[PDB]
Design a protein around this ligand. Structure first.
Ligand SMILES: *[C@@H]1O[C@H](CO)[C@@H](O[C@@H]2O[C@H](CO)[C@@H](O)[C@H](O)[C@H]2NC(C)=O)[C@H](O)[C@H]1NC(C)=O
Ligand SMILES: *[C@@H]1O[C@H](CO)[C@@H](O[C@@H]2O[C@H](CO)[C@@H](O)[C@H](O)[C@H]2NC(C)=O)[C@H](O)[C@H]1NC(C)=O
Ligand SMILES: *[C@@H]1O[C@H](CO)[C@@H](O[C@@H]2O[C@H](CO)[C@@H](O)[C@H](O)[C@H]2NC(C)=O)[C@H](O)[C@H]1NC(C)=O
Ligand SMILES: *[C@@H]1O[C@H](CO)[C@@H](O[C@@H]2O[C@H](CO)[C@@H](O)[C@H](O)[C@H]2NC(C)=O)[C@H](O)[C@H]1NC(C)=O
Ligand SMILES: *[C@@H]1O[C@H](CO)[C@@H](O[C@@H]2O[C@H](CO)[C@@H](O)[C@H](O)[C@H]2NC(C)=O)[C@H](O)[C@H]1NC(C)=O
Ligand SMILES: *[C@@H]1O[C@H](CO)[C@@H](O[C@@H]2O[C@H](CO)[C@@H](O)[C@H](O)[C@H]2NC(C)=O)[C@H](O)[C@H]1NC(C)=O
Ligand SMILES: *[C@@H]1O[C@H](CO)[C@@H](O[C@@H]2O[C@H](CO)[C@@H](O)[C@H](O)[C@H]2NC(C)=O)[C@H](O)[C@H]1NC(C)=O
Ligand SMILES: *[C@@H]1O[C@H](CO)[C@@H](O)[C@H](O)[C@H]1NC(C)=O
Ligand SMILES: *[C@@H]1O[C@H](CO)[C@@H](O)[C@H](O)[C@H]1NC(C)=O
Ligand SMILES: *[C@@H]1O[C@H](CO)[C@@H](O)[C@H](O)[C@H]1NC(C)=O
Ligand SMILES: *[C@@H]1O[C@H](CO)[C@@H](O)[C@H](O)[C@H]1NC(C)=O
Ligand SMILES: *[C@@H]1O[C@H](CO)[C@@H](O)[C@H](O)[C@H]1NC(C)=O
Ligand SMILES: *[C@@H]1O[C@H](CO)[C@@H](O)[C@H](O)[C@H]1NC(C)=O
Ligand SMILES: *[C@@H]1O[C@H](CO)[C@@H](O)[C@H](O)[C@H]1NC(C)=O
Ligand SMILES: *[C@@H]1O[C@H](CO)[C@@H](O)[C@H](O)[C@H]1NC(C)=O
Lengths: 418, 204, 167, 50
């Protein structure tokens, strides 16, 4: 019987709070399929490959071939639109400065590598290395992988050197440490937490990126999402090809053999069985490709949303940009997909304290403007809610409202007047 | 601009046109008209041709309906998006980036369009940018000061605290800033005066 | 069949006459008279798309033979999409106008002609990053953009009986 | 065919016998006896809902 994870009884009581005294910076990876291969099956040549009699017999079915071709062409144009919507979100092509004074944060493994002929980073290179004639053509995508890497490199450079400002308007530069202090405010942690722990935070980021690299180098199951797309398109094409070797009731599965063996009045009867079976096989293929392309379009719409909200901004949506409080995200191109390095703040090293909803003083009740009242046993401090930083309770920390005969759990203490 | 709606109209019309044109196909039968086959051939002979026409036309109808189901799934996705944008852009102000237009969303207005909706996304776009020198914190009496809500900037010689999205510099006092630390840990802290509103008041 | 017979180095066993490909197509054949192995390759085929600038603008037309080497088909271009005939290759990069593929787009421009170029993904803009330099906006713009979303389609009901078996 | 015949204002050319729609459905005819043009409309049909 499978286990649904581990049991945990949270130590709840009406006057106890757990506050984290530390944190970790976690970079998780999110792989999203964006496009699929732009195949295009020539309906006439698949059904009736180089056969005039078969082609004329197929003309009696009307516009089946034309509408199948129109469906597949719509799917191809849709794949190009998916890629454009995900990656062409940046108006210009931003470049990182020659000097990388990023406050200790090291993006060398996600920023593009000039040594490679492609504008491709180390991690993008790892991802690309990992993911791997009967009227059946494969159109190339409009944007080459070098162009996709240029796009994600511009997204990265704008993010690093300007924050979220480039998503809204003109990219406004801001030092990366100051942008990080902003993104710390975005999750309810004060700026000094970044500024006073800057080296530790930067090291945690660098180590997290290094572990990302190691995980990608060792285990290939991470890109299973994009690969499954590859293995589904390829499998559908292989079934389509292998359906050409079916009699479907005819004497043979070879039009040339049928034609060379039978006079036209007898041959057409078997050619009709071949046409019916092969046209049904093409319709099955095109229908499932439309369904699969709708799924890929939903995935690419999600990838575009995650580029807009995780990369071009900081998301207050929970678990949209990784588990934890979202700080920033980095796009990496991948074969027919995108990879987001969701950088998140995860609180750590929680400790118990005694918590009171309000503090009575001079008869009036006080509540913390921003923060929570905690006690280490004897003294009462007002601390941030996501990082233990106790402060003496003064009237700047707190606001008054009413007397102490209403609030349930109000305690007695001193709000020092500054 | 109305291509998104016109394309939907055109697709539905094309599907119907294809469906109707499929009625003029023999599909392997002698003729594409049931009346001609019935009037010419006796039932034992005509039933095979009618079966061919029935199978062809039923397959044509099934293809039409299935592609309508796929297309209606797409339209339901778009209508779910439009309902979400009505709820968040029109009935609220969205913090989601590029959900309600490029820029910082202020409001939206719905306009009905044939088989669709048009959102007039009003957004705030910062316009005229000025370079400044910035510092993460400020040393005053050993303490490090960080802006409560704002960023420290310098027009070259003087240090002000301004809001981040609109250059409105203000003199740095203890109401603008809060203290944390002793000026030894911050990387990039700068020396500058932090005014005290209470000091002149107590002086006078 | 029909195809190009090229002498091949298939390691045919003495008792083997033809070599079906994975797709169970007779890729190679042993010549009955001279016991030699001849690979069979289908004669060149592909799609033919037509790059047009718009009949109102011009009647000039560039033709893309998709996925065929130009040597196997006046201006001729060998794009990864295929052979482009009638478009003048240009080193300058502009925005994509008519997407041909593989990073290449065509457009009708200046005597005017159709030009095929590598598309440009916008204008390069190095941000003036520095560890102590910030850009702050001193003004703003109130932009009213427009978003258009389909909501419903036309409600059609087809009588299956009357469609298939009209009267 | 089956339908409702009405007088039509269509300007048939003399060599033309009948007129078809965009989807090649017979839309007008010319009476062989009296050289006049009659529009043919389908007899009214529709779902009966309760
Ligand atoms: C907060 O947690 C970090 C680790 O996530 C602590 O940093 C580690 O400290 C130990 C002992 O000082 C060192 O051996 C490690 O090398 C440090 N790791 C890193 C990544 O720097 C940090 O000391 C903790 N702080 C508090 C106040 O508990
Ligand atoms: C950013 O990280 C990379 C790799 O983690 C660092 O590159 C290494 O640099 C050391 C020397 O400091 C070399 O011995 C290694 O061989 C390098 N490895 C790779 C993969 O390049 C890089 O130095 C870091 N950035 C900074 C500014 O230190
Ligand atoms: C709760 O925290 C307070 C504040 O730090 C502690 O009070 C100080 O304790 C240190 C020793 O840990 C003394 O040197 C200071 O003189 C104390 N200050 C005051 C104003 O008393 C207190 O000891 C802590 N209590 C517990 C139970 O941990
Ligand atoms: C907090 O302090 C107030 C007053 O400082 C306490 O109120 C006293 O409560 C007792 C018992 O109910 C009365 O006999 C006194 O007359 C009250 N004092 C006043 C000034 O009204 C209150 O009990 C304290 N709360 C706690 C939880 O200890
Ligand atoms: C930076 O700003 C300060 C204050 O806004 C400027 O100082 C004032 O400059 C005006 C003229 O521009 C004088 O009339 C005031 O008397 C100055 N006041 C003080 C307290 O110095 C300063 O000139 C600005 N510097 C730059 C380079 O723009
Ligand atoms: C900001 O001011 C403080 C003091 O006002 C400076 O601290 C002095 O630093 C020098 C050299 O490091 C020492 O010789 C002095 O003894 C320090 N003074 C004190 C009172 O500690 C500090 O260097 C200034 N910061 C900058 C960037 O100039
Ligand atoms: C902010 O931008 C607006 C324009 O977007 C400026 O208003 C213009 O001001 C000039 C000169 O005063 C006038 O000729 C224009 O007619 C104004 N346009 C509009 C739409 O009112 C405004 O002056 C700018 N403010 C600052 C401080 O730069
Ligand atoms: C808080 O106290 C409870 C008391 O049983 C204990 O189980 C829990 O581990 C404590 N929390 C921490 C972080 O030590
Ligand atoms: C918490 O509950 C206990 C009993 O469960 C009660 O004695 C105590 O007064 C409560 N504390 C607060 C602050 O409500
Ligand atoms: C800021 O300084 C850099 C340094 O050359 C310059 O390129 C940039 O245009 C400046 N920004 C503004 C808004 O003037
Ligand atoms: C900024 O970086 C330069 C080197 O590029 C360094 O000399 C300077 O001290 C740094 N200043 C701050 C405020 O970090
Ligand atoms: C006749 O066919 C045999 C067997 O393929 C071959 O060995 C021989 O050379 C051929 N001779 C002629 C006359 O073609
Ligand atoms: C076309 O064929 C020539 C002759 O072998 C070859 O040199 C060239 O690389 C081929 N081009 C492509 C795109 O295959
Ligand atoms: C484009 O530039 C390359 C080298 O930069 C050159 O070899 C080629 O002839 C140029 N093409 C045209 C049409 O000028
Ligand atoms: C047929 O005769 C009728 C007279 O009853 C006449 O009105 C009509 O024009 C004639 N049609 C011809 C000659 O085509």
């Amino acid at each position: 019987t499978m286990s649904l994870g581990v049991e945990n009884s949270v130590a709840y009581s009406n006057n106890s709070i757990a506050i984290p005294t530390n944190f970790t910076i976690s970079v998780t990876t999110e792989i999203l399929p964006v496009s699929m291969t732009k195949t295009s099956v020539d309906c006439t040549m698949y059904i009736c490959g180089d056969s005039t009699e078969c082609s004329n017999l197929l003309l009696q079915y009307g516009s089946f071939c034309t509408q199948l071709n129109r469906a597949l062409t719509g799917i191809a144009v849709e794949q190009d639109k998916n890629t454009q919507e995900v990656f062409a979100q940046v108006k210009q092509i931003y470049k990182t400065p020659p000097i990388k004074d990023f406050g200790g944060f090291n993006f060398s493994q996600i920023l593009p590598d000039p040594s490679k002929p492609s504008k491709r980073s180390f991690i993008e290179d790892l991802l690309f290395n990992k993911v791997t004639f009967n009227g059946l053509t494969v159109l190339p995508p409009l944007l080459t992988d070098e162009m996709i890497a240029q796009y994600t490199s511009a997204l990265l450079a704008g993010t690093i050197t300007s924050g979220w400002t480039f998503g809204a308007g003109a990219a406004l530069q801001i030092p990366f440490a100051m942008q990080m202090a902003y993104r710390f405010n975005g999750i309810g942690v004060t700026q000094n937490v970044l500024y006073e722990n800057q080296k530790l935070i930067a090291n945690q980021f660098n180590s997290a990126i290094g572990k990302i690299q190691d995980s990608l180098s060792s285990t290939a199951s991470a890109l299973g999402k994009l690969q499954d797309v590859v293995n589904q398109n390829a499998q559908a094409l292989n079934t389509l090809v292998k359906q050409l070797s079916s009699n479907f009731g005819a004497i043979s599965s070879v039009l040339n053999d049928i034609l060379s063996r039978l006079d036209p009045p007898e041959a057409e009867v078997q050619i009709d069985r071949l046409i019916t079976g092969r046209l049904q096989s093409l319709q099955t293929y095109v229908t499932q490709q439309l369904i699969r392309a709708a799924e890929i379009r939903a995935s690419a719409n999600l990838a575009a949303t995650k580029m807009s909200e995780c990369v071009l901004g900081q998301s207050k949506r929970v678990d949209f940009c990784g588990k934890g409080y979202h700080l920033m995200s980095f796009p990496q191109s991948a074969p027919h997909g995108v990879v987001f390095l969701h950088v998140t703040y995860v609180p750590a090293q929680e400790k118990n304290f005694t918590t009171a909803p309000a503090i009575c003083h001079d008869g009036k009740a006080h509540f913390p403007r921003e923060g929570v009242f905690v006690s280490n046993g004897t003294h009462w401090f007002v601390t941030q809610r996501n990082f233990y930083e106790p402060q003496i309770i003064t009237t700047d920390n707190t606001f008054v409202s009413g007397n102490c005969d209403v609030v349930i759990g109000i305690v007695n203490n001193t709000v020092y007047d500054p | 601009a109305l291509g998104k709606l016109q394309d939907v109209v055109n697709q539905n019309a094309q599907a119907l046109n294809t469906l109707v044109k499929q009625l003029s196909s023999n599909f392997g039968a002698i003729s594409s008209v049931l009346n001609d086959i019935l009037s010419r051939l006796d039932p034992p002979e005509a039933e095979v041709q009618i079966d061919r026409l029935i199978t062809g036309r039923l397959q044509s109808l099934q293809t039409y309906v299935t592609q309508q189901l796929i297309r209606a799934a797409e339209i339901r996705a778009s209508a779910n998006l439009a309902a979400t944008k009505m709820s968040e852009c029109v009935l609220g102000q969205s913090k989601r980036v590029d959900f309600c237009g490029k820029g910082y969303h202020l409001m939206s207005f719905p306009q009905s369009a044939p088989h669709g909706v048009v959102f007039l996304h009003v957004t705030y776009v910062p316009a005229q940018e000025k370079n400044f020198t910035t510092a993460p914190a400020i040393c005053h009496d050993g303490k490090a000061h960080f802006p409560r809500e704002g960023v420290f900037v310098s027009n070259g010689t003087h240090w002000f605290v301004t809001q981040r999205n609109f250059y409105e510099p203000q003199i740095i006092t203890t109401d603008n800033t809060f203290v944390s630390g002793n000026c030894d840990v911050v990387i990039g802290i700068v020396n500058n005066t932090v005014y005290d509103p209470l000091q002149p008041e107590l002086d006078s | 069949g029909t195809g190009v017979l090229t002498e091949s180095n298939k390691k045919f066993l003495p008792f083997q006459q033809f070599g079906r490909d994975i797709a169970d197509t007779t890729d190679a054949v042993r010549d009955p008279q001279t016991l030699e192995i001849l690979d069979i390759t289908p004669c060149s085929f592909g799609g033919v798309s037509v790059i047009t600038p718009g009949t109102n603008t011009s009647n000039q037309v560039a033709v893309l033979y998709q996925g065929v080497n130009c040597t196997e088909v006046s201006n001729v271009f060998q794009t990864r999409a295929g052979c482009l005939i009638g478009a003048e290759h240009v080193n300058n990069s502009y925005e994509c106008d008519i997407p041909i593929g593989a990073g290449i787009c065509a457009s009708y421009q200046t005597s005017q002609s159709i030009i095929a170029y590598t598309m440009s993904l916008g204008v390069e803009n190095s941000v003036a990053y520095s560890n102590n330099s910030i850009a702050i906006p001193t003004n703003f713009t109130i932009s009213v953009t427009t978003e258009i979303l389909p909501v419903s389609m036309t409600k059609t009901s087809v009588d299956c009986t009357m469609y298939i078996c009209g009267d």
